[model samples]
Target: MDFQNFVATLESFKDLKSGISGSRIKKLTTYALDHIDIESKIISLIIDYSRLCPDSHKLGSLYIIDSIGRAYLDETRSSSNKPGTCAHAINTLGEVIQELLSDAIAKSNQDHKEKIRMLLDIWDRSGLFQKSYLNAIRSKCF
Candidate 1:
């Protein structure tokens, strides 16, 4: 493999760091698929409040991913339950993210796997979901 190509790919993520949702995700996903851009992909994956992510608005999705992982020998499994009142729609978005990530990982490369694992670890431990409806979603599956 050409080291130059790898470096170029790694650099691609910087362009996406401040990106917004929808298009940000699309471009970031594209970048990850074509290159070894890990940090940028993860940054986009767990988008911030300003990015307008559906997952940011809900909490259940985190539950599904962590719960299933916990059941299948994933000791790192951890959930982020948002506080305040809950909404069914936002919780559903969390589930969607969970399923999407699981499917993405089942077919990803070893490097991608590591990236995802680390990304999830941060996401779980961040406590960003403590103020949303994440726990409600977990109750459904648990």
Candidate 2:
């Protein structure tokens, strides 16, 4: 997926305060997986989106990261599934993502804060970042 299409696909989630599970999130993730390079850029791209896109899209972007982060980390764990681009990103950029999440949580407005904690639950369970990394996020988030 090209940068333009990626933005368009991400922007597909409209006026969404939260759609943790729905067609928009599903479609974006499926497209993200199909296009590995783009998937690799998910966290960084969303950090960009956090500034340029609507608040709804910024919030919507978090769960996409959550879902993709799960895929990357999970796909890496087993020999049968094995690791690839997705796995690489979670391992490499996880700290970057961790920092972004914690900062975003700190930066969020009241409404976004409540919604972001919802995603924090998923990320915590998924082990997408190191325990200390996640803990640092929790410390600043509240």
Candidate 3:
């Protein structure tokens, strides 16, 4: 998650003309989420790449949501689920993520409202969040 390392990883891809596969995209996202403190930074980077590149929007959007999902999953702990606890644990974590984002915006400082809205706009317009929670939620919760 080192910023230098993260940027270096991205820089290594600068020469490649084609976009990356979804799995590689997930790996890249894992690195960023593990290292970066700001969710906004993570989102901004995604939107920037999607905008500047001529790649297929589907691929770009896939990467964006993969990153968000990784962060959410990484932060949450798993349960043994010997008696089926894992599912509940994952569901709770998802609720935590949704609540955090929702409450933050609803109670956001008015001073930062514009910035929040801008970020939300970028995410929404980029078409990256297309029912992604379900995909993430189903990622082998056990």
Candidate 4:
């Protein structure tokens, strides 16, 4: 994955205000994940970008995260060799939420906390997470 190119793609949508950028973000995310061997690195990059993303694009960033989770779930099976990748993806998401929550707390920002909470809650109830991973995240990050 070319980090600079990925960053540039993200920057292209920074000022977008109308319509959902869901498909475009998913396309870029899927391409990067498909080409990059380091899943955690991709996830981390998304987390970093999301933290700095314009307020107008925040929801789209979260949707990108959702798409990542969906991609991994759709590809990995119980007996597949991709379990590590799946686990790493989940851990990456938990880390992102943890970092977001920590920042919100440090800043004493209720809105930020609420936004993070909304994202997490939606994911929790989305059936995107399996029982084990969901429970683990609930205990560890929620």
Candidate 5:
């Protein structure tokens, strides 16, 4: 992936003039699965959508994240020892996801706050990341 070209590719995932696209999320998940090597770049792109963007971008980012978790951990029913490629990617995402949650919860409205809680529960059971840490982030919101 070339630098600006890659970001533009990633930016296309955020074409949220109306709402988040399910097919687009699927494509991103597959792209991430294919390019787990370039994961650091993908991670930042996803995190930026989750963090620095508006409500729709934030929501869409979480949906994309959910697609990823389902592809990996849930498919494995899945756990323990060293993580695989996708799980490792999630492990990387997990750290920043916690930080994103804390900052975003304050900034989010009631509707978004609810979706965040719901999606967190889905991932919480999947156990891709640290449970205690995620719960702490989940609890701090009003």
Candidate 6:
């Protein structure tokens, strides 16, 4: 996403203190993801906000990441039951997981590690991945 636009969006929320609903969270995620190159940037921004923003906004940031992940998973699962679509989605998920795992390891921060763990857990428990793949992700993320 355009970093400037993302900043402006955050700036637009400056005076709000209420928690956002899931629908709004998904919308925000879509907006952010559209301008982002890689998913890591979305995650990094969330982590940065969690460190400095208010509790409500921090939760909003967390939900944005979650929403994007779920949106991908849902789209993958609903992709006309085509093998090629499924393969592509799995490949994308694998790449995303690997990148996040590396970033978390490189950062070596509790929060980052925990976030990776949570994201992995969400995917694993979503039944979107097979047992073997989920196990692999679990082992790698932990």
Q: Give the per-residue lDDT digits (tens) of candidate 2, residues 1-142.
A: 5667767877655555553446766766666666765554665665565545554455665767776667667766762222346766676556466656765676667888787776776677777767777667777668
CA lDDT, candidate 2, residue 10: 72
lDDT of 5: 0.68
**Model 3 TM-score, all chains together:** 0.39
Candidate 6 lDDT by residue in tens digits, 23-111: 55655567644643344455455445544555435444445545665655666455332333433434544445444444444444556
Give stretches of model 3 more than 4 Å off.
21-24, 56-61, 70-142
lDDT for 4 (candidate 3): 63
lDDT of 4: 0.61
Cα distance off (Å), candidate 3, residue 105: 28
Candidate 1 lDDT by residue in tens digits, 1-142: 3434434433443454322234333443343334332423233333321133243222322332233222222322322233211222123334455445554455445655555555465545653233233343233322
lDDT of each: 0.36, 0.64, 0.44, 0.61, 0.68, 0.52
Question: Ten residues in a row with the worst lDDT in model 1?
Answer: 78-87
Per model, how many backbone clashes are there? Answer: 10, 0, 0, 0, 0, 2
The TM-score values for the models, in the order shown, are 0.31, 0.71, 0.39, 0.62, 0.77, 0.44
Check candidate 5 and list the clashing pairs.
none
Better of 1 and 2 by lDDT: 2
Which residue pairs in model 2 clash with each other? none
Candidate 5 per-residue lDDT, tens place, 15-106, comes to 56634777767767777666766766676677776776665467666776678756756545532324446656667677788877766667
Candidate 6, which segments miss by more than 4 Å at Cα? 21-24, 33-36, 75-124, 127-142
Candidate 4 residue-wise lDDT, 2-112, digit = tens? 666766776677667631377677777676557546675677777776687665455556667777776766565442234347656755676556554344334434554
- Candidate 4 runs further than 4 Å off: 1-3, 18-20, 78-84, 101-121, 127-142
Off by over 4 Å in 5: 1-6, 74-84
